[PDB]
Write an enzyme that holds these catalytic residues in place. Structure first.
Site, PDB file in Angstrom:
ATOM      1  N   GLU A   1      57.394  76.524  58.811  1.00 12.46           N
ATOM      2  CA  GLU A   1      57.709  76.622  57.337  1.00 12.46           C
ATOM      3  C   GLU A   1      56.832  77.310  56.820  1.00 12.46           C
ATOM      4  OE1 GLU A   1      57.900  72.746  56.472  1.00 12.46           O
ATOM      5  OE2 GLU A   1      59.675  72.343  57.444  1.00 12.46           O
TER       6      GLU A   1
ATOM      7  N   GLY B   1      69.384  74.149  60.090  1.00 11.31           N
ATOM      8  CA  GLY B   1      70.997  74.660  59.194  1.00 11.31           C
ATOM      9  C   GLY B   1      72.212  73.290  58.839  1.00 11.31           C
TER      10      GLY B   1
ATOM     11  N   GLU C   1      59.605  73.973  67.521  1.00 14.45           N
ATOM     12  CA  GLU C   1      60.558  73.742  66.468  1.00 14.45           C
ATOM     13  C   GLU C   1      61.565  74.322  66.930  1.00 14.45           C
ATOM     14  OE1 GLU C   1      58.596  72.863  62.362  1.00 14.45           O
ATOM     15  OE2 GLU C   1      56.658  74.931  63.387  1.00 14.45           O
TER      16      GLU C   1
ATOM     17  N   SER D   1      64.882  67.790  65.358  1.00 19.75           N
ATOM     18  CA  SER D   1      64.442  65.885  65.060  1.00 19.75           C
ATOM     19  C   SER D   1      65.307  64.828  65.675  1.00 19.75           C
ATOM     20  CB  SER D   1      66.132  65.678  64.066  1.00 19.75           C
ATOM     21  OG  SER D   1      66.455  64.432  63.422  1.00 19.75           O
TER      22      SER D   1
ATOM     23  N   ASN E   1      53.879  64.627  60.742  1.00 18.11           N
ATOM     24  CA  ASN E   1      54.283  65.512  59.498  1.00 18.11           C
ATOM     25  C   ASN E   1      54.746  65.358  58.046  1.00 18.11           C
ATOM     26  OD1 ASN E   1      54.256  68.000  58.157  1.00 18.11           O
ATOM     27  ND2 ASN E   1      55.218  69.362  59.195  1.00 18.11           N
TER      28      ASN E   1
ATOM     29  N   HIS F   1      53.049  76.395  61.571  1.00 16.07           N
ATOM     30  CA  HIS F   1      54.421  75.509  61.572  1.00 16.07           C
ATOM     31  C   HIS F   1      56.041  76.692  61.248  1.00 16.07           C
ATOM     32  CE1 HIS F   1      57.138  73.025  59.495  1.00 16.07           C
ATOM     33  NE2 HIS F   1      56.903  71.670  60.435  1.00 16.07           N
TER      34      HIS F   1
ATOM     35  N   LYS G   1      54.687  66.270  55.719  1.00 14.47           N
ATOM     36  CA  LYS G   1      55.267  67.761  54.430  1.00 14.47           C
ATOM     37  C   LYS G   1      55.007  67.574  53.587  1.00 14.47           C
ATOM     38  CE  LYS G   1      59.031  69.185  57.973  1.00 14.47           C
ATOM     39  NZ  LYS G   1      60.574  69.687  58.572  1.00 14.47           N
TER      40      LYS G   1
END
Lengths: 245, 246
Positions: free
Chosen positions: A96, A169, A163, A208, A9, A94, A11
């Protein structure tokens, strides 16, 4: 056995020079296409030129799609238009898009259904926030997945991406913690869809990862691949794609 | 004010229809000094459209996000647009304000960011069927004030007044009411931005413009062009784009 799946991805990133570099890099890495289903998801404006320039063994997908046939929806990507140009995959839901654009569970399900009917493989994305992790991880992913089940009969061309939104964060999610959730997703699929659907269904980790520890992630029992974020812009992506050799 | 014609393809297209739509525009003779023509294809066609359509015609995105490159899966980047020679974008189209709930402030923010990165922005404004009753000017002025709150320099803004009730319904505003709304928009800009900026500001009419109702608008001095939807996919767009020069 579920075929290893690696999606990249990109993004909201890219220039003409960086997209050329990434694409020529994928074109020269040695792929065992029988070993890995590899897809890249570039920023919308690059979709067609990416499909034209990247070799056939690598799939191309959109980062989002609308849920209706061609029409008056300014700014949206059309599932029909995508597959007419050879773009055969798409992300839906997703994190986001769920968080920034408040896409609902039902809208994600509706997009998934329409994209499947029009001939795409859908990577449907799910996952819980930090506040939801406190007590409701299972309930959140189950609710997200149920909304897709309400609209989709045939799951052969879905892959689920988990995800760990709580960790963007938070700190780094460990492979153990990924395995936990993945096992819960596979339990849910068994109960809702049948064991033979759950056993064929790819559940890829969307948190990640790099090429060094992705081996540590696939050591765990229900992780079938990855939806890679920022590493997918970098040479590191080839070490995730190619991990088995 | 140079006359402006934009063609919004919306969420339409195939390889084959995009090829011939562009081919049609390429072989259409234009007076570039007289008309600024721009087309806004569906996102996936943005680069191929800029590659195939002649240089005299601009290419624009149908939407852009308000931030630098980053983790906004599914969005168009203003920086990436400029890097590839896409030099325009829509902001605030009615379909995004209504279906995706884009607020005045978000639209203003992505207008400001697109302008900072080099784009010319066609910022869309307009009232609903219900709002047409008594509230037309209240709505468009609120939508304009939000942009003015964020944007200092209007030289690369074009305003598209598109009554929502005229979008894809065949119910074009008559040029006579289009004129008066645009006159109010120009009075608003005169007061907010100064007479000099107001006199340079393109205010274009959108909503069911087509090859057959367009000439009627050209008699009206505050209508500085058109935003064309359904008709921009059709050969009669070849008229609309040249009709000011005839």
């Amino acid at each position: 056995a579920r075929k290893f799946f690696v999606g990249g991805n990109f993004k909201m990133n890219g220039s003409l020079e960086s997209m050329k570099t990434i694409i020529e890099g994928l074109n020269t890495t040695k792929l065992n296409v029988g070993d890995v289903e590899t897809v890249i998801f570039p920023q919308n404006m690059y979709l067609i030129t990416t499909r034209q320039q990247v070799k056939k063994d690598i799939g191309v997908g959109a980062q989002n799609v609308f849920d209706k046939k061609n029409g008056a929806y300014t700014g949206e990507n059309s599932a029909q238009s995508l597959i007419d140009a050879g773009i055969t995959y798409t992300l839906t839901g997703h994190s986001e898009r769920r968080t920034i654009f408040k896409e609902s569970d039902e809208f994600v399900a509706d997009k998934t259904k329409f994209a499947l009917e029009q001939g795409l493989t859908v990577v449907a994305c799910i996952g819980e926030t930090l506040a939801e992790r406190e007590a409701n991880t299972i309930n959140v992913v189950v609710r997200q997945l149920n909304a897709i089940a309400d609209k989709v009969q045939n799951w052969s061309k879905i892959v689920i991406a988990y995800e760990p939104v709580w960790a963007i964060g938070g700190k780094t999610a460990t492979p153990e913690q990924a395995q936990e959730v993945h096992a819960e997703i596979r339990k849910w699929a068994t109960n809702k869809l049948g064991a033979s659907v759950a056993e064929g269904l790819r559940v890829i980790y969307g948190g990640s990862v790099n090429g060094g520890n992705c081996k540590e992630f696939l050591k765990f029992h229900d992780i079938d691949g990855f939806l890679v974020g920022g590493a997918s812009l970098k040479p590191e992506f080839h070490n995730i794609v190619n991990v088995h050799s």
